[PDB]
Design a protein around this nucleic acid. Structure first.
Ligand SMILES: [Zn+2]
Lengths: 344, 62, 140
RNA sequence: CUGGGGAUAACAGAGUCGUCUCGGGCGAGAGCCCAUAUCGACCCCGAGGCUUGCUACCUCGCUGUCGGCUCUUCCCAUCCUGGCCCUGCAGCAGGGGCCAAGGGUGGGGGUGUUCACCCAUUAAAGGGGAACGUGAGCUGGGUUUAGACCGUCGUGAGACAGGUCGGAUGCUAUCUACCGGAGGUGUUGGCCGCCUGAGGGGAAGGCUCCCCCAGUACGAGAGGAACAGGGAGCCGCGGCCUCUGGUCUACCGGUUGUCCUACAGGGCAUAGCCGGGCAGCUACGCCGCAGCCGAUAAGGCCUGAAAGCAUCUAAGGCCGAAGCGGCCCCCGAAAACAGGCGGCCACCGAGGGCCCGGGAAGAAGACCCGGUUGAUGGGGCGGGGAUGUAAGCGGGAAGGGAAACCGACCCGUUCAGUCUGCCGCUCCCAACAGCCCGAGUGCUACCGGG
RNA sequence: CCUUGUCGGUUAAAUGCCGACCUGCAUGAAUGGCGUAACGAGGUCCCCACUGUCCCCGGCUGGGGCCCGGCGAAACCUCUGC
RNA sequence: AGCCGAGGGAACUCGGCAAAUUGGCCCCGUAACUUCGGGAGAAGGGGUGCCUGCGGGUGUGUAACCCGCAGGUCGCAGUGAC
RNA sequence: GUUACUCCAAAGGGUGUCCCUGGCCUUAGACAGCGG
């Protein structure tokens, strides 16, 4: 006989359209630094730089070529604190506290906002939460966040999410949260330059596709091409078992999947659309803008390589949950050149 | 980070782009794009094309 | 160290693209009896169903001698590739390519035959095999 | 040709296992001597059903087939990859055996071939099952029609489980199955948003080379290792378009033949042919893919009796694998204990759909952003890009003609003109006018207030 | 037939093709024997050139397929259908 | 049913099936073998547009159809498509 | 093992455990340790 490995992976099945456009983070890393474990933004475009290699391995100490993805990140607004307790099987929500004066555009997502809810009641509810957290029935604390697209002119309907906090304790977490609620978070207060990140997003749509493109099936011989069966597979299976198995390549939806990617290095965090190299202040937006995305105004991240999704899509980053043992240092690498030329 | 110079249309092009062509005699050529390279190996004359610099170098020799 | 004063190998950081498959005819650039060769295999390669082996610059191939002097024909040799027509990226991002596909005939343990390479050769070949740069009067 | 037959063969199935493949007991004898490192006769005892036969239980119009290509899955009697024990094991290696089925096991030459033979590589290039897996999936080389040739046999018509040339390939999917997409009812009041995660899937990773260790231990010399540490690639998986290549029947230019009278601008000839090409799609391009904790197998040990000694086991401990479980990724409230939290309505109206302008999404449905609290589409103004310097006017031009004047092409006016499935500013036109679905009833048997 | 006979040439590698041999199972002289220029939509082996046949597939066009309006069958069919 | 495809060029397959290459006209030059008629368009090579002109053949012909040469110039490409 | 039969493995072996039988030993036996 002849052997080869099967065509495609059974680890990303069922290959179906994502339940939502906003991604979902299922697991969170073990960090000791008490801080928010992630941030969110909108993707703008790609370009390239030249930098002196800091990462272990030959090519270290030389000038190389590095492609880069720019992620636009205006500040977030913290509007909630949420407690969790332990039930029979797993965690379960216990209490929520919201802030009172929320933007007029949050009701584009959450139509049913409360009516009286002044600062009196806000502070009373906070106090109740604290008297609960000092008891012992509490397992972890998380923050509720919403984005502000009105600043960059992208849209008005916002995105709402729930992020976790670092640390083994809950009262330190509550102090952090109680200090942060009602205000804005910027990315420099949370993310460091040089960290490894995991990026999380929803991929581009390709539509209904066949098995040649969707699983890697080999095109058939030219006689079958002239017979009407070239981009088809040959067999749906054997005679016994007398049913089709789920492992047989078929056609269907390709793209718009919820994906994750490990270990992408954050290189630079900028302020107001400009990158201040050691020497001088510079812009990142190229001549003529970015294709399919305009000009960058607020704040942005440089990410080494590629990430999942189309341009104006919502991305979510977290610190690496699966890092190696030989890490590159945490500091902005020496950058010698950044491309501002036309990308269209 | 050197800006290199096209051997067909004479302009400076940025790091991370272009091509180097090596002849078996050791002589070298730099190309900014696919167009300049194809026109070179095809045989076109950059001295008649007003978007190159050979054009001005000839405008002198007129 | 064990034995490094006189050696035959080295490390390149580039790993060019694999552009010359089995069945390809390469010119011989060295001054051995061989003029043309045909690739019949690639050393240090494992593949899959229905795939052919392919080599690029700096790679050693098992070849046959088609044209050449009588005491060299229908013989099986080993050769290092030194040039290719298909491009390949260098670290700074610029790309490089040559005018034809040439090889030098060598020994199964790196030592070359011949005494002079007529023409230029690629830098990666000479970084990987340290006795070739000692022959060619043009290295790029 | 007809009429019929599974009362009767070839083909796969069932039954059986002489043969077949894979094994075992005993100890003759061989191994410098030494029955058991290795080999094990003669005789005796078996497993499997992957060879072949025997029988004739199913099927004579269900389908009659060999090989190949494509595609999925399983067994272990293990070829490499992980871990160990004996050696007639110095090292490098070899031979023989135990656990282990997670991954891999490829490319070519003649032949219709399966197998077998050969080449060059490789960590190694294992053997089998699935209706001798797979023709409502392809092909059609072989084989079993009708044509013809040779050799033998035959008085002849003619035959050959002998060779050779040639010789039809049908389907609108009724039911189930699978891949993907939607609409309902239920969850004992309805609707927003955000979370838990029962369970299910996973190879998401597998392997090789180089430096060093070290010309070191071992070895008379020849030769020649290992743990730790650093790096690189091949096969596989999942994504992106900054760079490089391909296409780009948007767009720009050059040119042939003919027609619109000639210029100019156009139609047709596969976009007429040629060259270049942005967005978009793509790979020949580029980015990413942990080893750690737990419990075990073969095996190696401690304590320790049965059996006052001894003994890894009987009872009890400690270690110990690419294998099992979890950490990690994908799906997932129809998870029938049919969940948890916050908020808004009900006991006119919270919310939702149609409709309008569009795509970052798309076979229909669904999805996403916007709708005058407005830059969603168009336009105008500018930026960037693709081609490559428009028509007209003025001057020159090989040469010709009395002269007026012809004249392919060239220079200037001109980084020009044409175009923009790209960005920005700006309310100049249009996102108006509206229309429909919609919870709302209670009792005893109650839980805790009244 | 034993047969992929043997020796040589052609290939990295030859159950092939070509050239020699002869124990012709079972050649042979008008059921003609040996040759043969030119011819053949005849069978067969090699070389050069050419290529998406293949490595290994990708992009584009027109017609269908899909939605909408209209006309409108049949083969098949015990009942059913994990 | 059709158009293009980098680098390699039959490694595909029973088999180079299918597709591609060549392609009109003038000049030069053309083998083995041969039934001396052929092979033979063997093979292999160079040229080919537009413009300005100069000459020749037949003819009474600044009617008509044909045959040779120089110079200038444009393009990746002059049997430019068919 | 939970199989009347229909439909279910051997030769060869076992200080695994529960029992029968018959010899030899025993007031110093059968192991140990101390020495000849
Ligand atoms: Zn240029």
């Amino acid at each position: 006989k002849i052997h080869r490995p099967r065509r495609g992976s059974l680890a990303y099945s069922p290959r179906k359209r994502a339940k939502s456009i906003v991604p979902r983070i299922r697991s969170w890393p073990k960090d000791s630094e008490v801080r928010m474990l992630g941030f969110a933004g909108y993707k703008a475009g790609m370009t390239h730089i030249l930098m002196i290699d800091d990462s272990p391995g030959l090519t270290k100490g030389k000038e190389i070529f590095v492609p880069v993805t720019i992620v636009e990140v205006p500040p977030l607004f913290v509007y909630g604190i949420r407690a969790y307790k332990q039930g029979y099987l797993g965690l379960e929500t216990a209490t929520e506290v919201w802030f009172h004066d929320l933007h007029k555009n949050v009701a584009r997502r959450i139509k049913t906002l409360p009516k009286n809810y002044n600062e009196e009641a806000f502070q009373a509810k906070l106090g109740q939460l604290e008297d609960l957290v000092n008891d012992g029935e509490i397992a972890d604390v998380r923050l509720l966040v919403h984005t502000q697209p009105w600043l960059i002119g992208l849209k008005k309907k916002p995105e709402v999410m729930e992020y976790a906090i670092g640390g083994d304790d809950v009262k330190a977490k509550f102090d952090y949260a109680k200090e942060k609620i009602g205000k804005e978070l910027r990315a420099g207060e949370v993310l460091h330059e040089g960290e490894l990140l995991d990026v999380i997003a929803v991929t581009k749509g390709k539509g209904t596709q066949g098995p040649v493109k969707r699983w890697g099936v080999k095109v058939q011989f030219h006689k079958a091409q002239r017979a009407g069966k070239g981009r088809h597979i040959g067999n749906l299976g054997p005679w016994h078992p007398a049913r089709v198995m789920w492992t047989v390549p078929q056609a269907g939806q390709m793209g718009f999947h919820h994906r994750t990617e490990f270990n992408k290095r954050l290189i630079a965090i900028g302020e107001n659309g400009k990158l201040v190299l050691d020497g001088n202040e510079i812009e990142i937006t190229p001549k003529g803008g970015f294709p399919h995305y305009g000009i960058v105004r607020s704040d942005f991240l440089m990410i080494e390589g590629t990430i999942p999704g189309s341009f104006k899509r919502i991305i979510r980053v977290r610190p690496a949950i699966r890092p190696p043992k030989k890490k590159p240092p945490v500091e902005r690498p020496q950058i010698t050149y950044v491309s501002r030329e036309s990308k269209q | 980070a050197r800006w290199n110079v096209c051997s067909y249309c004479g302009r400076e092009f940025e790091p991370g782009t272009g091509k180097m062509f090596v002849r078996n005699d050791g002589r070298v050529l730099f190309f900014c794009s696919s167009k300049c390279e194809k026109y070179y190996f095809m045989g076109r004359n950059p001295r008649k094309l007003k978007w190159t610099k050979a054009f001005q170098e000839a405008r002198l020799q007129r | 160290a064990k034995k490094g004063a006189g050696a035959t190998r080295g490390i390149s950081p580039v790993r060019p693209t694999r552009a010359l498959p089995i069945g390809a005819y390469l010119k011989v650039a060295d001054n051995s009896g061989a003029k043309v060769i045909q690739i019949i295999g690639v050393v240090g390669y494992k593949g899959t169903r229905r795939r052919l082996a392919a080599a690029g610059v700096g790679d050693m191939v098992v070849a046959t001698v088609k044209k050449g002097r009588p005491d060299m024909r229908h013989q099986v040799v080993r050769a290092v590739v030194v040039r290719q027509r298909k491009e390949y990226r260098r670290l700074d991002g610029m790309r490089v390519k040559f005018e034809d596909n040439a090889a030098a005939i060598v020994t199964p343990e790196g030592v070359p035959r011949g005494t002079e390479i007529r023409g230029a050769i690629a830098r990666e070949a000479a970084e990987r095999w340290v006795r070739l740069g000692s022959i060619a009067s043009i290295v790029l």
